[PDB]
Amino acid sequence: TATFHRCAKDPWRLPGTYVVVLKEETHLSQSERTARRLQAQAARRGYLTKILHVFHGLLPGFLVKMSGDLLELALKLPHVDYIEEDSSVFAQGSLVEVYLLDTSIQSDHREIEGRVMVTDFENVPEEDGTRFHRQASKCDSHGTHLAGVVSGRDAGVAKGASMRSLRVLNCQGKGTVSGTLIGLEFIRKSQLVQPGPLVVLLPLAGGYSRVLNAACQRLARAGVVLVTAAGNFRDDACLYSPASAPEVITVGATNAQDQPVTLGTLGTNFGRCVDLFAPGEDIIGASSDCSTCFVSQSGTSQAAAHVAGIAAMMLSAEPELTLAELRQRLIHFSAKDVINEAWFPEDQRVLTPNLVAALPPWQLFCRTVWSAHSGPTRMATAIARCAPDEELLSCSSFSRSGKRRGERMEAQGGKLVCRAHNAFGGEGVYAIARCCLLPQANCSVHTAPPAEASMGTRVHCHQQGHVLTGCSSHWEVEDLGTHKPPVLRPRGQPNQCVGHREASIHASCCHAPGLECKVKEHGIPAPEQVTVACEEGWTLTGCSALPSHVLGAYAVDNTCVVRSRAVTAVAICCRSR
């Protein structure tokens, strides 16, 4: 079960250096012993090996410089979880400390002097080209500009923000996954020996990295707010790291014309793994050119820095705020539907959030979570998960072909997940969760059976003080059965699950102090999409479709969208008095 991992993007691979990640409860002594063992084993095979770093505090393992010939031997080692080949990363009131993993910084620049601390942590790869020389250059530019965007006196977002610099990107703005990993370990060791809310800005990106995402998840679980650039490759950000880590706040870049940023032939990364977008074109900030100089830059780094700033401001006001609460407020205070989605590839539009970060001017906050596409297999499933602190209040599904078996809100590892099931002959499906933060919530999913008899049809939260937040429907007839057109369960009251008689129904029932929910609906006879929205003050919790004819239904902020090929959109709107 010991696996080997390498970058998908061949030019970004760095063979010879490997990250050996050991099993969960492996202690420091066991990492050292395993490293000494690898070295001794290699030496017997007549190979020189060098242990560069022994990871502890963040994840268990070590960093090793060795021939790839020795991989097969290192996978046979005890306690080994997996081995990941190192690869390149590229440059893109209370005291809140903001860590910056980037290039060097001009700490004496008037814009950021006395607010920026240089940690002395430096871990960078050597520059490409046998005759490369920095010369009059201080390899300051990027980092200096980004500290300016975050905390700069005249052009900064969070002017009252303490910052700490870690040199992780060389003169050519290049770093390694291994160097970043060491940087992150330094941040965790720092917070272990120190008190204070933390924000970590990672304005860099490389190809999907299992270990980078793992280290990022570990830090996030330790209550650290990690903000990252989505990537400047006009591509699915899920293919990139730390971009792909769900725990990190992933930021895409937009220009003044509310358009996604174009960077030459490429531009801002898009899709599912992008949490939100922020100003990222022609961004004025400090210039390493002089102590009083400015420069306008572009890229998802600039955009990430804005969010790191907004995070710092929110945390200076309420330092106790959780990463869940912060992400929900970040989404909440954003500008909705401003972005022109035309620039993104058609199939990625649905998955790309239409939010631009903005500062804020007993609440129920919700966010939509899109799953990855399932396979084309008839038994294939898609799964959308919430954050540990959140509640799965609703679960929907969407297929481009419309061949769907429906969806389920099922517990998986003691936590409710939104699982969507593909159908016989279907392209594949997406699972769309609605992840919420509801104050003193006691929530449960009750499962109702298919109802083909006359009566027993009405699925609702029959419990006193328990209110319906959302409904899921799963088609209960097997593929080798006899297909008959699905019949709808009659409607009596509004506050009941809309569904087919032949389907099982999963009802989310929440009990909370001042929770009140309502059902809104809107139908059109011959549409491509039907829509219904929750009023100002109300939060969309559930989104469902009344009528195969329908491709699916999904939440788009406080709007329930039903996509068709009368078509009704059924929404549950909640609020907390």
Partner: peptide
Amino acid sequence: MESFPGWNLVRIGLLR
């Protein structure tokens, strides 16, 4: 809006 120095600061609602 039009791109100008500090447009980002008004976009995020820091400046009026």
